[PDB]
């Protein structure tokens, strides 16, 4: 709105509040990495994440042999040695050296004494491997190519109760398995059995009864039965059967025997629900009744009582001279039946069985088996359970213990078994694994923390093993510590890892959509082949947390989904969504983020509700209580939707006129959004969703002012800004912003920034100054838009193709820039060192043009495909030559050279011009005789920019001093600026206090530049083998050619067909002509209609812009023109300043229209807009035929549609090979377009030839073309001679297979 | 079929079949040295097993 919307006003449709604004889209990675690296004072750095976390986890490396420990106090981070601007060029690693302070003094001493001999601690500083820092954009630039780390999504480390839906069983039934999957430890299971026996298996080992694992713990004997089944008392054989009970359990039970009361009449014959019987028992002063043989007496029964729980015959011993409470309707005997299948009684037996199941084939002992079971689950380091797992277990099962214990508690297993036994009979609900509440996201922070913890554990083991050899007495620190014991573990994470992938830096939209990605693969995720069908499916809890519209349509579909626009992540790791809290009727204005698991026990009301009055008057607002949406009342509505654009991702939010196309087709349009190469001189779309400005200003692609000071001068390559209008005292003089020029991006595409401010034009802090790549006036752009006319044109657009005119190429609107950045090395060899020779032997003199004497092409030199970029010759050993070649050489007298031609050559392509060349030399020789002029020019440019910055700073200093001393003949006194030279001396103090800061700032700048020049003169480091390297930044300016892949804003795509002249195109009325002719047959097939409405709105706004620009052409600043401009726009449009003429210059190209995703313009709105624009209400206009000169006898649709230029170019896709390098072991042509690839003749392609009668085409295409090496040259000789014939004896692959089979015991010998 | 062609930069690149043959040759030589030295049956048995 400040300096962005004033230059170009964009009207917005829909009626939606804008109370809460979406946070920055890159806040996820930044907030995750900030928790790891605190970067604060010493008393700070208190949290469960970061290197300090693992350090406090295991700080002391103690040894019982010598009793020496290492203590941790704190760690400090140093400044980076190389900046990002030099790290990108030098191909270094951007990181900060880590330093930790460790004390070697140990409290333990000999003879059980107290303080050690050395009372004062060592307190030495030990160097550690640096960790890569995070740029403000979150790029993680470890090498010359920045690589970001995507977040991982895996199962939450909590207990789950999943039962199969009658599968993997002989008969229809459910298993009801329970898992205790921890964060870092062995997994546990309590799956049932078809025989109703509880079986426990640890880490998917051999199944054994859970009674053994229960006896292994402290609970032994009848304690396992007293805690699972209740006991009811009975009389010791009194008159009849006197059993004092109560009716809490007799409700709804089939009485097999007469349960009538001894003194009252009850226990009716039917005995159903027993509601009246329950009431009578409640009013009968108890549930006592008078009554068998089959009972498992759970009493803790040596003289009279014995083991086992069953009488079953006659109640022997006269009731031994409290039995059990287990019926067959509500409770089951599964736990009791498990005690009869196990043969282990003593705890030692269970321990031996567990040890045998864990470590098979080994004699178990009571000493070793006890430690194994104690370390398996009850160990701190062995069994780790995060706090989120403990809180999840407490939420699922109430325990009142969290954040204090990490190992599996002995009481938790009993509670889990009880819950499982309860859920087996019923009255329980299983927990789905696909629920979003049971899934947490692991960002880069937790992964890097785990990697650093593993590295620190390895380092601790190494230090403990090495501390025994060296004498601890009379020693010090920094020596008994490995230099790189864990630095490799952190360096391999960024280098080789499924999560950390290449950066998709193709445009400002891809830079912001690649960081909000949630992958499901990697170290601890389901493999693509093990995904299945349930993981790829979408769950109804993803509403507002995961946009189900942005997903790759390849094999890994449903696994690379991204987050929403308002979705966040809690401290635990769950996904959060904002929900505006609403009270009874009157909606509140306090938005609160509701988690996925917590939002289940609430009601949600959708947005777009009538809020004209204080409350919704419809009383039937559509809302989803829990998952499924049902029409609910206005009573007890607690949560309301915050905004309609909450369930869609940032990529899908840019699609204008959404909700009118198919769901599957909209998915393709999202993938094509982040695939358009940035075009030169692009513009914002006429019909935009409004989210483009936020995604443009949020992403790190455009510069933003940091202060309020005005601009001084814009030199194109660097913009200077004043200090501020309200700048602080003794602050920086002026803020200098250098805009990046044409430089190769990560995807081989140009990236440049252009200024937008002029002289003066005071800017407010936090405003975009210069646009980035593919951006204009701050608003995001992807490509130019042209007039479109849906109609078949002589079959040129028969299939899914597009036809364009030559007018689109004449203006050069779709042309882009590319950069290859070839490189070359100069590694030495055993038989002499290589050299960059200016002249290669036996080369033509004409090919040496545009080549410097050093051997590198000059900057700005035109090069063609197959040209010598860098002339390099390597020493070649003596090799035998054919006698005919020797005779020819002796005849001509020339001498054979001893060097081989290995100069770099441009591959087949457009062969653009050179941009920049960079050479690096070894430390031995730097600028001795090569690239001396390059270093001279570099130092001259450095001195020039230093002098310019010093001059501008001195000018600002003089201006500030003049404006400060003006209060107390200055123009005729140039030398009196720093010296008053007057009786007044009060201002001298302030003058000195300002001059000291100015001098220290100038000295800091000079010192920084001197360190820069010293680092440049010192020379960059290279691998030991190579001694010199050169890089050529060749750039190509590609244009739109036939065969290119051009896709629209929606899912519509298509290769560009043959371009026609301007006259052949359809001649519209008033002389205008269309630019593209799309096929209208894609509407019925692909259910997408938003493109038609988009075209109509584009035509309307283009007509409005054409009618408004003509009004100003008559007389500028006309009173009537402002009236029309205010009438057409929905009022902050009129401005008192003179900038109204500048707004008309932008509005002449069409007035921008901003339509929301869900609150877009309805049919009546677009109809009224078309009517006001002057176009016919139907939307279609009469169009003539330019090829013939006749008018079509039917109305046609024409309008402005947003078109993109996809990266699938035709020049990089075409490839043809005749004879290239063959394989090494197979002796076949190599594959891939890198170095003369060959189109693979697949197995399915061989079946096609076998289907036909062709037998000679398939015979020679498999033996003489690639397989046979002997007869491979015979066919070429026959072709070059003129005779068509070939002979194939046997392929090389069959010989290799025969040699392979002979290596084994098999004897494969040929016969006949 | 198990080449050891030197890649660009002086760093060789061999196939994984050389490791198995090298390990087999090393274990065979170790067993041959064990049989000549007249080692105990416990060590000679483990060598044959390996």
């Amino acid at each position: 709105q400040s300096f962005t919307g004033k230059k170009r006003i964009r009207k917005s449709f829909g009626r939606i509040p804008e109370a809460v604004q979406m946070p920055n889209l890159i806040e996820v990675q930044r907030s995750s990495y900030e928790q790891f690296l605190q970067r604060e004072t010493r008393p700070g750095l208190r949290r469960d994440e970061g290197v300090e976390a693992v350090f406090k986890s295991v700080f002391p490396i103690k040894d019982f042999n010598e009793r020496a420990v290492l203590e941790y106090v704190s760690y400090e981070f140093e400044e980076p040695k190389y900046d990002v601007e030099e790290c990108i060029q030098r191909d270094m690693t951007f990181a900060a050296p880590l330093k930790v302070k460790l004390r070697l003094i140990v409290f333990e001493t000999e003879e059980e004494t107290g303080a050690r001999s050395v009372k004062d601690i060592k307190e030495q500083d030990v160097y550690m491997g640096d960790i890569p820092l995070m740029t403000d954009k979150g790029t993680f630039i470890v090498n010359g190519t920045e690589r970001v780390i995507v977040s991982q999504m895996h199962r939450s480390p909590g207990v789950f109760f999943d039962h199969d839906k009658g599968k993997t069983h002989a008969s229809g039934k459910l298993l009801f398995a329970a898992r205790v999957i921890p964060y870092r430890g062995s997994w546990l299971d309590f799956e049932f059995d078809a025989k109703d026996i509880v079986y426990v298996r640890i880490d998917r080992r051999r199944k054994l009864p859970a009674t053994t694992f229960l006896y292994a713990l402290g609970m032994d004997g009848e304690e396992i039965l007293t805690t699972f089944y209740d006991v009811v008392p009975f009389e010791k054989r009194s008159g009849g059967w006197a059993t004092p009970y109560k009716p809490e359990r007799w409700r709804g039970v089939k009485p097999e025997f007469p349960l009538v009361d001894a003194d009252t009449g009850e226990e009716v014959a039917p005995a159903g629900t027993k509601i009246t019987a329950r009431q009578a028992k409640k009013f009968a002063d108890g549930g006592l009744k008078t009554l068998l043989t089959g009972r498992y007496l759970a009493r803790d029964a040596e003289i009279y009582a014995e083991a086992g729980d069953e009488l079953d015959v006659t109640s022997i011993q006269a009731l031994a001279d409290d039995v059990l409470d287990i019926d067959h309707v509500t409770v089951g005997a599964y736990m009791r039946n498990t005690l009869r299948v196990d043969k282990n009684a003593i705890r030692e037996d269970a321990l031996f069985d567990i040890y045998r199941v864990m470590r098979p084939g080994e004699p178990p002992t009571v000493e070793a088996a006890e430690a194994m079971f104690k370390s398996l689950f009850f160990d701190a380091e062995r069994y780790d359970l995060s706090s989120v797992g403990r809180v999840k277990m407490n939420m699922r099962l109430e325990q009142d213990v969290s954040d204090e214990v990490r190992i599996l508690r002995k009481e938790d297993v009993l509670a889990v078994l009880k819950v499982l036994v309860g859920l087996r009979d019923g009255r329980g609900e299983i927990d789905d694994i696909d629920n979003l509440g049971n899934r947490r996201v692991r960002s880069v922070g937790e992964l890097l923390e785990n990697q650093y913890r593993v590295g620190l554990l390895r380092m601790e083991r190494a230090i403990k093993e090495r501390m025994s050899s060296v004498d601890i007495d009379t020693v010090m620190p920094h020596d008994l510590i490995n230099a790189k014991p864990a630095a490799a573990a952190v360096r391999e994470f960024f280098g080789s890892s499924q999560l950390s992938q290449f950066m998709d830096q193709t445009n400002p939209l891809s830079e912001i959509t690649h960081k909000r990605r949630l992958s499901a693969l990697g170290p601890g995720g389901l493999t693509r082949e093990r995904a299945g069908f349930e993981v790829r499916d979408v769950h109804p809890t993803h509403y507002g947390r995961i946009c189900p519209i942005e997903t790759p349509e390849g094999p890994n579909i449903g696994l690379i989904n991204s987050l929403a626009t308002h979705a966040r992540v809690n401290k635990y790791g769950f996904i959060e969504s904002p929900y505006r809290r609403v009270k009874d009727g009157k909606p509140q204005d306090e938005v609160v983020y509701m988690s996925a698991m917590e939002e289940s026990k609430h009601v949600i009301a959708q947005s777009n509700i009538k809020v004209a009055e204080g409350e919704i008057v419809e009383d039937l607002v559509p809302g989803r209580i829990n998952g499924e949406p049902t029409l609910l009342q206005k009573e007890t509505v607690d949560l309301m939707d915050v905004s309609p654009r909450q369930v869609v991702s940032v990529a899908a939010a840019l699609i204008p006129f959404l909700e009118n196309d198919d769901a599957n087709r909209a998915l393709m349009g999202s993938n094509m959004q982040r695939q358009a190469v940035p075009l030169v001189q692009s513009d914002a779309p006429l019909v935009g969703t409004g989210m483009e400005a936020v995604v443009a200003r949020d992403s790190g692609a455009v510069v933003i002012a940091k202060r309020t000071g005005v601009v001084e001068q814009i030199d194109g390559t660097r913009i200077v800004i004043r200090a501020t209008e309200e700048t602080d005292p003794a602050r920086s003089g002026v803020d200098i912003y250098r805009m990046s020029k044409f430089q190769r991006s990560n995807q081989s595409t140009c990236i440049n920034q252009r200024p937008l401010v002029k002289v003066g034009d005071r800017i407010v802090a936090g405003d975009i100054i210069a646009d980035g790549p593919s951006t204009e006036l701050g608003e995001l752009a992807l490509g130019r838009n042209a007039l479109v006319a849906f109609m078949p044109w002589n079959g040129y657009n028969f299939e899914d193709s597009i036809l364009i005119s030559e007018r689109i190429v004449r203006d050069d609107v779709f042309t882009s820039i590319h950069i290859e950045e070839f490189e070359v090395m100069a590694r030495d060899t055993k038989l002499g060192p290589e050299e960059i020779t200016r002249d290669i032997p036996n080369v033509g003199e004409e090919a040496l043009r545009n080549l410097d004497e050093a051997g590198i092409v000059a900057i700005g030199a035109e090069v063609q495909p197959g040209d010598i970029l860098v002339g390099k010759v390597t020493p070649k050993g003596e090799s035998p030559m054919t006698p005919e070649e020797k005779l020819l050489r002796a005849i001509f007298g020339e001498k054979a050279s001893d060097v081989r031609d290995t100069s770099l050559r441009l591959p087949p392509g457009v062969a653009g011009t050179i941009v920049d060349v960079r050479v690096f030399n070894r430390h031995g020789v730097d600028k001795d005789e090569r690239a001396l002029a390059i270093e001279r020019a570099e130092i001259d440019r450095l001195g020039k920019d230093r002098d310019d910055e010093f001059a501008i700073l001195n000018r600002n200093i003089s201006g500030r001093l003049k404006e400060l001393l003006i209060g107390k003949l200055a123009q005729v006194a140039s030398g009196l600026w720093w010296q008053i030279a007057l009786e007044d001396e009060k201002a001298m103090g302030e003058l000195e206090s300002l001059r000291r800061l100015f001098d220290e700032n100038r000295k800091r700048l000079d010192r920084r530049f001197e360190d820069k020049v010293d680092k440049l003169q010192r020379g960059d480091e290279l691998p030991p083998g190579v001694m010199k390297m050169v890089k050529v930044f060749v750039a190509v300016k590609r244009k739109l050619q036939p065969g290119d892949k051009m896709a629209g804003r929606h899912g519509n795509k298509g290769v560009i067909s043959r371009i026609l002249p301007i006259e052949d195109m359809p001649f519209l009325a008033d002389g205008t002509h269309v630019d593209v002719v799309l096929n209208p047959l894609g509407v019925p097939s692909r259910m997408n209609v938003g493109q038609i409405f988009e075209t109509h709105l584009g035509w309307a706004c283009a007509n409005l812009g054409k009618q408004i620009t003509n009004l100003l052409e008559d007389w500028q600043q006309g009173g009537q023109k402002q009236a029309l401009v205010e009438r057409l726009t929905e009022e902050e449009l009129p401005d008192t300043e003179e900038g109204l003429v500048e707004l008309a210059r932008n509005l002449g190209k069409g007035v921008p229209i901003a339509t929301p995703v869900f609150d877009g313009a309805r049919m009546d709105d677009i109809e009224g807009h078309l009517e006001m624009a002057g176009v016919n209400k139907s939307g279609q206009s009469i169009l003539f035929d330019g090829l013939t000169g006749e008018q079509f006898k039917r109305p046609v649709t024409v309008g402005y549609i947003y078109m993109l230029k996809l990266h699938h170019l035709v020049d990089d896709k075409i490839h043809a090979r005749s004879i290239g390098p063959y394989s090494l072991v197979t002796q076949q042509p190599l594959g891939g377009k890198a170095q003369f690839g060959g189109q693979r003749f697949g197995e399915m392609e061989v079946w096609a030839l076998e289907a036909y009668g062709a037998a000679y085409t398939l015979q020679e295409m498999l033996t003489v073309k690639s397989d046979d090496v002997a007869g491979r040259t015979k066919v070429y000789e026959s072709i070059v001679r003129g005779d068509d014939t070939f002979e194939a004896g046997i392929p090389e692959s069959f010989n290799v297979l025969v040699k392979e089979m002979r290596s084994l015991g098999l004897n494969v010998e040929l016969e006949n | 079929l198990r080449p050891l062609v030197p890649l660009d930069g002086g760093r060789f690149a061999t196939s994984d079949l050389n490791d198995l043959y090298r390990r087999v040759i090393n274990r065979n030589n170790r067993l041959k040295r064990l049989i000549e030295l007249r080692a105990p049956d416990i060590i000679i048995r483990n060598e044959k097993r390996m």
Partner: peptide, 11 residues
Amino acid sequence: DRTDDPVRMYL
């Protein structure tokens, strides 16, 4: 009683 480990059997 199956092991499938030569070093385990040796130890």
